[PDB]
Amino acid sequence: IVDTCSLASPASVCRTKHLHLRCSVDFTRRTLTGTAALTVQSQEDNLRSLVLDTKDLTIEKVVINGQEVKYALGERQSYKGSPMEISLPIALSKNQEIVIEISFETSPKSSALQWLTPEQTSGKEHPYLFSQCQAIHCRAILPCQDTPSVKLTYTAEVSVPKELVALMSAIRDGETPDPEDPSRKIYKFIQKVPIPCYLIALVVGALESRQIGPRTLVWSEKEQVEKSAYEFSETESMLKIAEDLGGPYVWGQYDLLVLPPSFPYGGMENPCLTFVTPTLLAGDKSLSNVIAHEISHSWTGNLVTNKTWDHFWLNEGHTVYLERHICGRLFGEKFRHFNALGGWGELQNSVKTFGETHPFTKLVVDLTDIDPDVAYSSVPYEKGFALLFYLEQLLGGPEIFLGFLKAYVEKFSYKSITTDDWKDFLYSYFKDKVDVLNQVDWNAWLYSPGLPPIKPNYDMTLTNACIALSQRWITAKEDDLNSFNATDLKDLSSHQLNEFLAQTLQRAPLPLGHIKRMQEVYNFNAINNSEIRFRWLRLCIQSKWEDAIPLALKMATEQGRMKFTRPLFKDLAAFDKSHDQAVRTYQEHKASMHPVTAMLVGKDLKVD
Ligand SMILES: O=C(CCC(=O)N1CCC[C@H]1C(=O)O)[C@@H]1CCCN1
Ligand SMILES: [Yb+3]
Ligand SMILES: [Yb+3]
Ligand SMILES: [Yb+3]
Ligand SMILES: [Yb+3]
Ligand SMILES: [Yb+3]
Ligand SMILES: [Zn+2]
């Protein structure tokens, strides 16, 4: 009903139908300058003004019908920014449209953007810029109705130093020299499918591309292209599976962009151009579920969208459910269950971390006065997933539940919805299984904090060997350590190795002699897989091994994926031997970190 994260006019007052963006990237000033032309349709009679979201934007003027109009910026409301009211020259009737042209400039401190100097890049000779608009940072790039309840099409023309390449969440529509300036190029983009504004994305850097499938290029700096092509080579097979599960892929191209290491997420589902962390580059495709997840959002999230951020689980739960079905089609149902049981484990971790009563462990959250970056967690992912896996099992199994998902996607394509919309459609589709549905504790699942009231059933086949080795280490006494050997690992996949470490980490600390023996026989220090290394380093630091302190600081600072960086810094702050170092290292690095990450690691460490 009400988007408590947006200050703009709601969609019941007016709706943006289209954005035509013309902007210029200035690396010297770290500003984006340009014009945002919004086509806005009135939803009411006699509309004479409207309000847009902005954060730290400089507004030059607003033009309608070729004349400047009056506008007013209200006072800042912390993380929400400042509302911008515009006085329309003529009153609009219901469904009438006008085009509002706003000239603006971003702040170098924009919460949407990270600006990188040449030394922070792979090639060391060119700077780099990237955006991350989800959840509410589009307002820090351009003035807009910064709410997923509104969906618009967009066209953009971006001017950049001619040695650099611009990409956006859109189909590429040519490059030309900038006729106003020969040192620059203009890149053009078209997004013909309506999208919420959190899906607007921009990258500018010394990018190259390699084709990896019929509708997929990978893009990165030259140094990463080869490894990326290999690592994501499953993309087209996964797109095909996802089409079978969700119906047609409506976006045209499915390209991948591998960001610098400071990117805060594993991935970001920007339409036409999924953004991924280079920490995926394990060498063996083992972290490809991230891609399966990003691909899945082309249906769940990007086609059917949460109406407000309070209903984020809709986007994420369903996406995790489809992701695990793609991985299950490729590798088997026993693997699907393995990954699902892992997921429950992750849910346990988040709920223990927040506390059983914390409101951020509820599936549907109330984000009134809560910065969504602060609330962000695995909970909507994994409690959302568990709810759907529970429902699958209750309602007749995966094939049956997959027909509901495809139907849900068809019903709500191109729209924005609430948890109640979803639940009503669930009841409608499963009208002949209402008796079953009423056995569900909805208030607990949707609205109560803590672990779900009921645990799904999981096949244990692939997990048993992980638990068994974990238990042998946990229950080992000193006189048992000689019995461990490298051959312990011979029949474990890399996913199984990660799960053995996750199991053991849940029981951490182990004795220091146990962790040393583990290094001696398994040589976990040599593993470069990011997930495995992250869990190993946490196990080491929680077990108080001083030798791991430099390896942990290094991992925490050399990449910036929040999943890895936030807990490493937290573990390092909690180890007395590393506390001062963790703080100092944060303080030394904070100015060159991603602005969201920096804010969050500062809160975690209770510094500034
Ligand atoms: O759903 C995703 C990607 C998932 C993602 O990056 N995750 C899941 C929890 C931690 C993080 C990660 O794997 O680094 C994006 C994040 C904001 C909107 N959608
Ligand atoms: Yb009104
Ligand atoms: Yb009227
Ligand atoms: Yb003027
Ligand atoms: Yb109903
Ligand atoms: Yb013994
Ligand atoms: Zn997601």
Whether residues 335 and 262 share a domain: the answer is: no
Q: What is the DSSP letter of 482?
A: G
Instruction: Give the contacts of 396 (CB within 8 A, at least 6 positions apart).
Output: 433
* Side chain identity at residue 413, one-letter code: S
Ligand nearest to the CA of 426: 5
- Give me the phi and psi of 477, to 5 degrees please: -100, 180
Alpha carbon nearest to ligand 1 atom 19, residue? 268
Q: Beta strand 304-306 with 273-276: parallel, antiparallel or unpaired?
A: unpaired
Alpha carbon nearest to ligand 1 atom 10, residue? 563
- Residues 319, 381: Cα–Cα separation, whole Å: 8
- Residues 310, 453: Cα–Cα separation, whole Å: 21
Let me know: does 38 contact 197? Beta carbons within 8 Å: no
Q: Taking the CB of residue 139, how many other CB atoms lie within 10 A of it?
A: 31
CA distance to 109, 388, 549, 585, 590, per residue, from 607 (Å): 19, 39, 20, 12, 11
- Residues 294, 251: Cα–Cα separation, whole Å: 13
Residues marked as binding for a peptide? 132-134, 264-269, 561-563
Tokens 């000689």, located at residue: 482
- Residues 65, 92: Cα–Cα separation, whole Å: 13
Whether residues 311 and 216 share a domain: the answer is: no
Work out the burial of residue 603: count CB atoms within 10 Å of its CB; fewer than 13 is exposed, 13-18 middle, 19 or more buried.
Answer: middle
Listed residue (285, 281, 225) closest to 255, CA to CA:
225
Q: Beta strand 255-258 with 216-220: parallel, antiparallel or unpaired?
A: parallel
185 forms beta bridges with 160, 177
220 forms beta bridges with 208
The domain that holds 264 is classified in CATH as 3.30.2010.30
Cβ–ligand 1 distance for 269 under 6 Å, the answer yes
Cβ–ligand 1 distance for 377 under 6 Å, the answer no
Is there a domain that residue 466 lies in? yes
Count CA within 13 A, CB hemisphere, residue 277.
Answer: 25
Instruction: Give the contacts of 183 (CB within 8 A, at least 6 positions apart).
Output: 161, 162
Ligand nearest to the CA of 318: 7
Active site residue 71: no
- Residues 301, 314: Cα–Cα separation, whole Å: 8
Listed residue (521, 605, 595, 522) closest to 569, CA to CA:
605
CA distance to 153, 239, 402, 408, per residue, from 247 (Å): 21, 11, 11, 11
Distance of CA 173 to the CA centre of its chain: 26
Sheet holding 31-42, edge to edge: 67-68, 58-64, 97-105, 31-42, 14-26, 151-161, 181-196, 171-178
Take residue 157 and report the two structure tokens written for it. 């023309």
Residues marked as binding? 132-134, 264-269, 293, 297, 316, 561-563
Whether residues 326 and 398 share a domain: the answer is: yes
165 forms beta bridges with 205
Listed residue (220, 24, 27) closest to 117, CA to CA:
27
| Count of domains observed in the chain | 4
Take residue 572 and report the two structure tokens written for it. 């390092």
The domain that holds 514 is classified in CATH as 1.25.40.320
Distance of CA 565 to the CA centre of its chain: 15
Q: Taking the CB of residue 30, how many other CB atoms lie within 10 A of it?
A: 18
Take residue 64 and report the two structure tokens written for it. 């309608």
Cβ–ligand 1 distance for 373 under 6 Å, the answer no
Mapped onto helix, strand or coil, the DSSP state of residue 49 is: strand
Q: Taking the CB of residue 457, how many other CB atoms lie within 10 A of it?
A: 11
- Residues 332, 47: Cα–Cα separation, whole Å: 56
Tokens 């969609």, located at residue: 11
Is there a domain that residue 110 lies in? yes
- Residues 552, 536: Cα–Cα separation, whole Å: 10
The torsion of the CA quartet 185, 187, 188, 194, rounded to 10 degrees, works out to: -140
CA R_g for the chain:
25
- Residues 534, 317: Cα–Cα separation, whole Å: 24
DSSP string, 17-51: EEEEEEEEEETTTTEEEEEEEEEEEE-STTEEEEE
Q: Note if the bond before 509 is cis, omega within 30 degrees.
A: yes
**Which of 71, 254, 376, 381 is the catalytic position?**
381
Instruction: Give the contacts of 237 (CB within 8 A, at least 6 positions apart).
Output: 330
Let me know: does 26 contact 32? Beta carbons within 8 Å: yes
Tokens 């209770």, located at residue: 606
Let me know: does 269 contact 378? Beta carbons within 8 Å: no
Listed residue (339, 257, 337) closest to 291, CA to CA:
257
CA 46 to ligand 3 centroid distance, Å? 5
CA 68 to ligand 4 centroid distance, Å? 6
Work out the burial of residue 600: count CB atoms within 10 Å of its CB; fewer than 13 is exposed, 13-18 middle, 19 or more buried.
Answer: buried
Alpha carbon nearest to ligand 1 atom 13, residue? 266
Of all residues in the chain, what percent are helix, strand and coil, respectively (each to 5)? 45, 25, 35
Whether residues 279 and 310 share a domain: the answer is: no
115 forms beta bridges with 129
Q: At what angle are helices 235-246 and 289-296 packed, to 10 degrees?
A: 40
Ligand 1 atom showing the smallest separation from residue 378 Cα: 9
Is there a domain that residue 2 lies in? no
Cβ–ligand 1 distance for 114 under 6 Å, the answer no
Phi-psi region of 478 (alpha: psi -120 to 50; beta: other; left: phi over 0): alpha
CA 438 to ligand 6 centroid distance, Å? 53
**Which of 294, 392, 499, 531 is the catalytic position?**
294
Query: Which of 265, 290, 296 to probe ligand 1 with, by most ligand atoms within 8 A of CB?
Result: 265
Listed residue (561, 556, 560, 608) closest to 581, CA to CA:
556
Please tell me the experimental approach by which this structure was elucidated: X-ray
Listed residue (141, 406, 198) closest to 312, CA to CA:
198
Whether residues 72 and 99 share a domain: the answer is: yes
Is there a domain that residue 7 lies in? no
Q: At what angle are helices 595-605 and 562-574 packed, to 10 degrees?
A: 20
Instruction: Give the contacts of 28 (CB within 8 A, at least 6 positions apart).
Output: none
Is there a domain that residue 377 lies in? yes
Whether residues 248 and 320 share a domain: the answer is: no
Tokens 């992250």, located at residue: 534
Let me know: does 138 contact 127? Beta carbons within 8 Å: no
Whether residues 200 and 211 share a domain: the answer is: no
CA distance to 223, 271, 452, per residue, from 210 (Å): 12, 19, 44
Cβ–ligand 1 distance for 268 under 6 Å, the answer yes
Whether residues 262 and 323 share a domain: the answer is: no
Is there a domain that residue 583 lies in? yes
Whether residues 286 and 228 share a domain: the answer is: yes
156 forms beta bridges with 21, 189
Whether residues 51 and 144 share a domain: the answer is: yes
Alpha carbon nearest to ligand 1 atom 3, residue? 267
Whether residues 445 and 553 share a domain: the answer is: no
DSSP string, 132-179: --TTTTGGGTS-B--STT-EEEEEEEEEEETTSEEEESSEEEEEEEET
Active site residue 294: yes
Cβ–ligand 1 distance for 561 under 6 Å, the answer yes
Work out the burial of residue 90: count CB atoms within 10 Å of its CB; fewer than 13 is exposed, 13-18 middle, 19 or more buried.
Answer: exposed
Q: Beta strand 255-258 with 273-276: parallel, antiparallel or unpaired?
A: parallel
* Side chain identity at residue 172, one-letter code: R
Let me know: does 113 contact 140? Beta carbons within 8 Å: yes
Sheet holding 47-54, edge to edge: 47-54, 82-92, 71-73
CA 288 to ligand 1 centroid distance, Å? 13
The domain that holds 449 is classified in CATH as 1.10.390.10
Cβ–ligand 1 distance for 498 under 6 Å, the answer no
CA 373 to ligand 7 centroid distance, Å? 14
Mapped onto helix, strand or coil, the DSSP state of residue 379 is: helix
Listed residue (137, 209, 123) closest to 172, CA to CA:
209
Alpha carbon nearest to ligand 1 atom 12, residue? 266
Cβ–ligand 1 distance for 518 under 6 Å, the answer no
Mapped onto helix, strand or coil, the DSSP state of residue 68 is: strand
Let me know: does 568 contact 575? Beta carbons within 8 Å: no
Instruction: Give the contacts of 534 (CB within 8 A, at least 6 positions apart).
Output: 555, 563, 564, 567, 568
Cβ–ligand 1 distance for 500 under 6 Å, the answer no
Cα-Cα-Cα-Cα dihedral sign, residues 307, 312, 314, 318: positive
Phi-psi region of 380 (alpha: psi -120 to 50; beta: other; left: phi over 0): alpha
Is there a domain that residue 6 lies in? no
* Side chain identity at residue 408, one-letter code: Y
* Side chain identity at residue 182, one-letter code: P
Is there a domain that residue 327 lies in? yes
The domain that holds 170 is classified in CATH as 2.60.40.1730
- Residues 259, 296: Cα–Cα separation, whole Å: 20
Whether residues 249 and 390 share a domain: the answer is: no
The torsion of the CA quartet 142, 147, 149, 154, rounded to 10 degrees, works out to: 20
114 forms beta bridges with 130
* Side chain identity at residue 113, one-letter code: L
Resolution in A: 1.7
Residue that finishes a domain, picked among 260, 287, 302:
302
Residue that finishes a domain, picked among 205, 220, 246:
205
Instruction: Give the contacts of 504 (CB within 8 A, at least 6 positions apart).
Output: 470, 473, 474, 510, 539
Take residue 128 and report the two structure tokens written for it. 């780099």
* Side chain identity at residue 440, one-letter code: V
Residue that finishes a domain, picked among 406, 426, 459:
459
End-to-end CA distance of the chain: 36
Domain range spanning residue 313? 303-459
Beta strands in 238-362 (DSSP E): 255-258, 267-268, 273-276, 304-306
